[PDB]
Amino acid sequence: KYTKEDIFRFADEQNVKFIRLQFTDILGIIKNVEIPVSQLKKALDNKIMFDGSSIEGFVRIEESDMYLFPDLDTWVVFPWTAEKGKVARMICDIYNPDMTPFAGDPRANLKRVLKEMEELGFTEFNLGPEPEFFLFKLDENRRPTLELNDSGGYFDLAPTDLGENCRRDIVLELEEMGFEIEASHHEVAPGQHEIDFKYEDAITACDSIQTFKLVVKTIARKHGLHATFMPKPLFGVNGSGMHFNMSLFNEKGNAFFDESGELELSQTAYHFLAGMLKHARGYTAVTNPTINSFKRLVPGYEAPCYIAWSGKNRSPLVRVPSSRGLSTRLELRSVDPSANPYLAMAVLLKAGLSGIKDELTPPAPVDRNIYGMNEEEREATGIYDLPESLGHALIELEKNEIIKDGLGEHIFEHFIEAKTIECDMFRTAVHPWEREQYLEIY
Amino acid sequence: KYTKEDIFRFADEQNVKFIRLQFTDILGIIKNVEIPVSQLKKALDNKIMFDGSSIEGFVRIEESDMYLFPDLDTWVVFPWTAEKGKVARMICDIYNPDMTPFAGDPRANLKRVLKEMEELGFTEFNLGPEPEFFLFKLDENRRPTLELNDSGGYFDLAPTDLGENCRRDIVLELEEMGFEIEASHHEVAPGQHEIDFKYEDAITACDSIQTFKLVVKTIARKHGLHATFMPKPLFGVNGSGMHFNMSLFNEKGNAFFDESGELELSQTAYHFLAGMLKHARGYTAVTNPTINSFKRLVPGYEAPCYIAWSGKNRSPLVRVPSSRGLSTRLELRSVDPSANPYLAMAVLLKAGLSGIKDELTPPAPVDRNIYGMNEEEREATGIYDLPESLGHALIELEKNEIIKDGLGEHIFEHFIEAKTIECDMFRTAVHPWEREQYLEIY
Amino acid sequence: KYTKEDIFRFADEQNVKFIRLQFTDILGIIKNVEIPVSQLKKALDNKIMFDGSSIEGFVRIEESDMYLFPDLDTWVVFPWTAEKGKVARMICDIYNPDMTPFAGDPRANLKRVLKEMEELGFTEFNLGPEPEFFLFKLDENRRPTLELNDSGGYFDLAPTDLGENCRRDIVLELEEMGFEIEASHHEVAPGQHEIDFKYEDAITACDSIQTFKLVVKTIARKHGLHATFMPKPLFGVNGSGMHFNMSLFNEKGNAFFDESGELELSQTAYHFLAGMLKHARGYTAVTNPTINSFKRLVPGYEAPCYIAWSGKNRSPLVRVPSSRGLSTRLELRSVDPSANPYLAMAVLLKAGLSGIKDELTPPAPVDRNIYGMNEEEREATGIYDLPESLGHALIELEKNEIIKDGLGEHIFEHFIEAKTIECDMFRTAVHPWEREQYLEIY
Ligand SMILES: Nc1ncnc2c1ncn2[C@@H]1O[C@H](COP(=O)(O)OP(=O)(O)O)[C@@H](O)[C@H]1O
Ligand SMILES: Nc1ncnc2c1ncn2[C@@H]1O[C@H](COP(=O)(O)OP(=O)(O)O)[C@@H](O)[C@H]1O
Ligand SMILES: Nc1ncnc2c1ncn2[C@@H]1O[C@H](COP(=O)(O)OP(=O)(O)O)[C@@H](O)[C@H]1O
Ligand SMILES: C[S@](=O)(CC[C@H](N)C(=O)O)=NP(=O)(O)O
Ligand SMILES: C[S@](=O)(CC[C@H](N)C(=O)O)=NP(=O)(O)O
Ligand SMILES: C[S@](=O)(CC[C@H](N)C(=O)O)=NP(=O)(O)O
């Protein structure tokens, strides 16, 4: 743990002229408040209020006042605000003025369900994500447009890769913030890039994910580009999906490692699988909270459409990397980077360890092309489709209780009313698709 | 009736020059062909054949060849500027290479189910439809714009209803084609138009419907405006429905008319409703065979939203016009003018005739305005909500096996497939609404 | 030879910041992935993998996860990567996750055929390339226009060769990267360029080739010019193909130099050419693997048109440069820079190592201008005619089962699929040519 006092003098060895307290709203969006180095004790002693009412996902305007308490380990300095004022960073948890924490804080609802594996013995919850992102050219307005940075491809090179000089500026801006970056490259769709790093403690891997998305964006609008974490911005091309590499640690040993099994996977991992897969239909409404996230979960674009799993195969809902070692992990790939990392982790922790506790037995590893299977030749194998509309997936989540009770009373009730009414805008609205399709033939 | 010896007489009488053989495809699309008056006798020998694989939903390409047998009762000369190109049409029944009526021919389907009221004792099946349509301007190159001629409202007056020479010229041309016209006016939303005509038996009111769209499609395009029967071409204004006013007749009798029961309504009628009411869930993919009509089917714009009935009231599924007697009608507002009036009539007959052989005890009249209740108030009565989408409205249909038997087994087999892919063709696509709300946001 | 101890040294000596792991897909398309020096150990431990399903022609999606084993004798720093993000490269080999190598990987297909020359006693199957490219200007939005920056001819000078300082800044950039470069000059057709570099043993020239292209694409786009290797980009002017200057060696002695035989040429030398002459029809699908290069193979433009050889003459399929000694070389000419430098060598090795176990008494020099002979004489001497299209070269390929074996089999069946697709995706399409010559005509 970082100290409170040596943080006060952390600003004098680097003359930090501002600190940015930052937390996260219900929809995954990073809100912020900036304060000078002048107010540093006023925040470290937890006396910084705000207006709760206007942050979508919090209390009503009657009980508006809400305080902010910093997590003194999430101290980095913003490397690009040299020369103006060296700007630090600190992540906060949201507290009601009763000094009772807020059960609607997205970072509390993981800070609590990470203690249920405490009651049953595991060291850590290791998340290494793969947040994929597209990049679009800007204009004279510097207001983004739907023309991608290159008509490139998977692993292709300059001249065909025009973010080669951009990703590289993004990775060295992230590494200056104390990361360990695995690789950098261009994904299979045009303008689609992927920067993956090394796994971390569940919450400090989640904190690190809200870091990444802010660096990828500010350092692109510095390259003439704009970075989108929208899952399916085009038709008929790979979507951007934030893979979920999960692995529990236990006393300096990967909980998933069976040293001399055939699939070298402990029967902990095997009842971990049946956890999410049983519950897959419920919780994905959370892990893909935008209507468009389903417009991406279609057959053919390396995205999963059916609830299943296999080994080193990129069709199913979960993939097992053929390399395990101490990096042994199972790859839930039905996560896209519009969900809340704090909330996808909490949900999938619960309904995931619910499979070892209940000891659920795991279904068949479907080792072929899941997209190449008849409507009725996969219906004999029991595997069935992931829900197609947000209305459908919200019904099958609200139905589910095991994940509904790790979503908090205040978050779920504040969530489905936001996802439904977001979806009614859709169902009521007519798009220019429908004009094209009908207006002249009828 | 009309003998073959009339048609020749009328040709050499009215001096027609070319003959058209119209029929209607699976989706509602009147498709015809031209022959000289030198062919007049050959078509009446019913020895004139077209490409069967080439009209949607009819047949496959290995049994392409299919015959056209005209209906001499339909003869009407086309009255536009054709002195030398004077026309004459005849709506065709479709037959096989073995002369048996074609299962797919929807003109056959209507008549087929019509013989199911010849055994419940009813002379006719009258239908007075209200096909409401929109008027759009045309560009310099005669392509449909997205502006509408005027910005008037219900019943408005010149100079704020541009289509007042338009409908004038629409109505007159119809009055030449054997029509008797009731009225011509402006509807709720701007550039919308209602033209009404006296009821007729189905296979002749619907022939007065397929004739209607054409002679508004063309006469409106003679005033330089393209006309649509798209349900809701603009979000936030009344989708144009095509109200379905019907009546069964009994030895010169309006079989819904007995001036005693609760409203001066009969029992063959009070029973009819419970058939619709019960089977209404399962016939909305036929009354509304398009993704877009489910966008008129949000409430507030005088369209049906839930499955209940009332009097004098334009909010429910079925309104009953106060005027009664011969004017005693059952008004069904769920149909919109994209639908197939040979499949729509065929189906509702087998919904409501399933309510004279059981009569199924109709539910309560909600004389409120049903748009103004709550999810706890709909459930208080227990009123069925019309389905969500072309998605549900497709599964809700392959349940009602009395309705499936109103389309036939080869018309339903070529109507689920043609909507399934058309439904899938929208489910997968990404339309601009998805990028506005998310691209610059996530 | 270089050791993994040497590369831990240079990264801290050069102070490089990223390592790029590179390979080639089936089509000659370079695909590489960038990683920090912070992961220099994981690749030298071979513990870095990728997605095989996305490398065009590597594998199919069910068994994707595949390893990356790096080659150290391939290490070079990039020189254009300032002191801010300096870059070191390493060409790799592909290993299936079970640590067995990949039969579809082209680099090891060569290694296996270069072992077929250890059974015949040959230290080196040396190769010198002549990749010829075009230069197209760049528009305002960095898009390669249809203008050639210069309108010159052979060996011309400033000011009638724009890319004079271009071919300078490439050479230096090549010269920083351990290259030995012969000659930098303007080629025949306008806006054409050649850069000759001295030979190296096959797998290291194939490295030096795919590398050399990357250095001209990226440098040419510094001066803002698209660098392309399309064989016949313009019709009616010289095609830019990649000559193949090959020579065998045994104990520091060229195996083709014996100043007794008629042309100062050896026996294995003369014998080699029969191994190509007959087999030439077969591999002309691997040396010209594109629709476009079969318009280059036409007569007139100093490119092989029929299968023939001769001395100091630049019409035939094989040229033999007058200069002999250690520069005693055989010049194959069908190849275009769109061919796979790994496939071509293992093809031509097994092709021309077939003329040393069989040797087929190679035919005699038609040292005429074979560009100027009518059909009455081409089948007089019996000179085989080259295939006329991709689709012809393919059927001509699946018969010489030794070239087929030269390719392995995975590469082969992965090859016939896509080119038959490519050949068929061009057989069926319609291009504005046929629209001029027939539309207003017929
Ligand atoms: N034991 C583990 N638990 C969780 N995540 C891991 C583990 N080992 C590796 N990872 C993560 O897997 C990710 C690999 O990224 P990438 O190479 O894009 O995956 P893929 O092989 O699916 O393409 C990294 O983010 C890394 O942190
Ligand atoms: N007895 C009847 N049976 C069936 N349809 C009828 C009957 N009387 C009138 N109609 C139809 O009602 C239509 C007129 O409807 P409209 O004036 O729009 O009434 P509303 O405004 O109540 O819908 C006419 O087209 C006519 O054919
Ligand atoms: N003995 C040899 N073995 C292999 N390659 C050779 C030999 N001699 C020359 N080369 C190659 O020939 C190339 C020079 O080609 P170039 O100068 O264009 O000759 P030409 O103009 O006759 O084609 C060099 O790239 C070199 O690698
Ligand atoms: C090549 S991809 O394999 C693409 C997967 C897809 N874009 C998605 O996850 O949505 N995934 P990864 O980065 O793990 O290799
Ligand atoms: C009030 S309206 O009823 C307009 C109908 C509405 N736009 C609909 O068809 O959904 N039609 P009409 O007055 O002729 O009965
Ligand atoms: C006689 S030329 O040979 C002209 C090149 C020709 N257009 C070709 O197809 O290679 N080239 P080079 O002198 O490099 O051998």
From TrEMBL, chains A, B, C:
Binds 2 Mg(2+) ions per subunit. Residues 106-442 form the GS catalytic domain. L-glutamine 2 binds at residues 132, 187, 239, 296, 302. ADP 3 binds at residues 197, 199, 245, 314, 319, 326-328. L-glutamate binds at residues 238-239, 296, 302, 314, 333. Its cofactor is Mg(2+). It holds the Pfam family Gln-synt_N. SUPFAM superfamilies: Glutamine synthetase, N-terminal domain, Glutamine synthetase/guanido kinase. Its main location: cytoplasm. It catalyses: L-glutamate + NH4(+) + ATP = L-glutamine + ADP + phosphate + H(+). This is Glutamine synthetase. The gene is glnA.
